[PDB]
């Protein structure tokens, strides 16, 4: 929802940083499906769009 203070969603632990560790290690290893996620979220601008950051925080906690 915000793009002037983008790091607001990083202050709820569970989990905080380990979500970023998650996405780090995925960027290291699963790059194919990684960029596939990146460009598959790139077509639905209605409410069917899935927030990788918010999905990550919710799921991980």
């Amino acid at each position: 929802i915000n793009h002037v203070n983008p790091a607001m969603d990083f202050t709820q632990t569970p989990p905080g940083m380990l979500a970023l560790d998650n996405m780090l290690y995925f960027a290291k290893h699963h790059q194919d499906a990684y960029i596939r996620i990146v460009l598959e979220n790139s077509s639905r601008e209605d409410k069917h769009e899935c927030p990788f950051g918010r999905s990550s925080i919710e799921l991980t906690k």
Binding site: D32, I35, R36, V38, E40
Partner: protein, 549 residues
Amino acid sequence: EIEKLNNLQAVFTDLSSMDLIRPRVSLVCQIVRVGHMELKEGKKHTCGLRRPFGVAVMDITDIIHGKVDDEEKQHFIPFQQIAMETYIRQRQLIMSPLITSHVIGENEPLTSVLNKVIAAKEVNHKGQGLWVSLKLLPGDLTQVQKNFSHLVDRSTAIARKMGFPEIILPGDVRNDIYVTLIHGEFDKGKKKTPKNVEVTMSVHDEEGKLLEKAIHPGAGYEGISEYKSVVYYQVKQPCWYETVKVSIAIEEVTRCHIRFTFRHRSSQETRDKSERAFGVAFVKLMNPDGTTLQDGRHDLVVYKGDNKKMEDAKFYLTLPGTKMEMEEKELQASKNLVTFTPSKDSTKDSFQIATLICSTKLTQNVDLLGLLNWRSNSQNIKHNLKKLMEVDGGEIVKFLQDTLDALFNIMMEMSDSETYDFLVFDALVFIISLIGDIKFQHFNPVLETYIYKHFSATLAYVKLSKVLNFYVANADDSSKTELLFAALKALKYLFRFIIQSRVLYLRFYGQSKDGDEFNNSIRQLFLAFNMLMDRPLEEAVKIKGAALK
């Protein structure tokens, strides 16, 4: 065309588990751009011309095995594409400046490309590709167009694979002519750029008039009157791997020649439009014997120079376009220097097509059409019969009933050479042995149809019972055995022929002058079997086992 934006249901038929056992299974997907010749500016290029762009590849070995059934899953195909990448690869090469090179965008050999992308274990697609889920549906259009309306609607496209089936029904209607384009020679010459050939293959009647829709370069797409081809960037030995499909009325195609014009394409649109075909090739669609041009890799013949002898429709029927025919022209010229002389319109260019046509009506069997018109050429019947048992089953089963009746004409009309009729017997034995297989089990209904409907022989039972009885009784020869082995593995259907022969004779003749001797022939037939199974079985253990079988 946003019509195929969402409802792309496709089915590319003619695939079996025989196709599955190919050790590694894949699908190749090359995509070309249409429009400007090149995606830059500085001048005006022709609207709607083609340079290939790259290949998107995924292997489908166990994907078609159907262990994982996933409707939505849009597997990503990493779209390998020609490296139009000269931004960072060259700008900084320091400490040794001597650099003069060129760019290979369409100067790229296709075998290399295909086998590399197969053997390239990672393609950094730069976020480029597309999305499909390949599904494998058993059955044919009936099931998918009844059961799988959610998987296959009516508008579901079809592609017809380069394969005669293994479950081969009669009337598996295929007027389906497949011709493939691979490569040709085109040297540098004056303008050291090899000439920018855009294949303009043209389908004419017997007088050079172009017909409509006959070229179908897309399976599931509609036909065209005229064909433009994709362009490679002046390759001195260009390779296309190009494939188009055509479909013609089985009669008109017999009186059709198809002319192939190669037009030179300058960079600019207007001079591209003004320049005409610098070289014109073609091919017929038949053989003077009535057969069609044999299949396989046919290197092609093209020429430059004249432009009126390359368009005078009634003449260049009489010109060469392919190898087999160019050397027959030169051989008949090698034996007579009259009415044919190789000309001086030949350029150092070339092309080749590997033709493989899966249609029911064309006949690439010289021996077969020797058989059919045998009244003209009944002399070769020696060699015709000798080489029958070397014929592919498919060509046979294509016109089996007509070939049967032809053979019956030989055996009825020509009663002189009984040994020729022995050869006839052997040939029909070969035929029926082919018929009995599960590769062609579907034609037995057709055989019953012919028998109970068109079996028009009357003398056949007498003579053929005599022949088989001579065979069986006098089979002590080891070379004569295997003929009788296959005969014993073919008894029922030839007996059907014998019985239909006899009953037709009796209905033609009211009663019998030969019933006594015919039933005799049966009795000595069984006597021959007895004597067989009382010879030293050392010769025919298996064979007499099959006899009682």
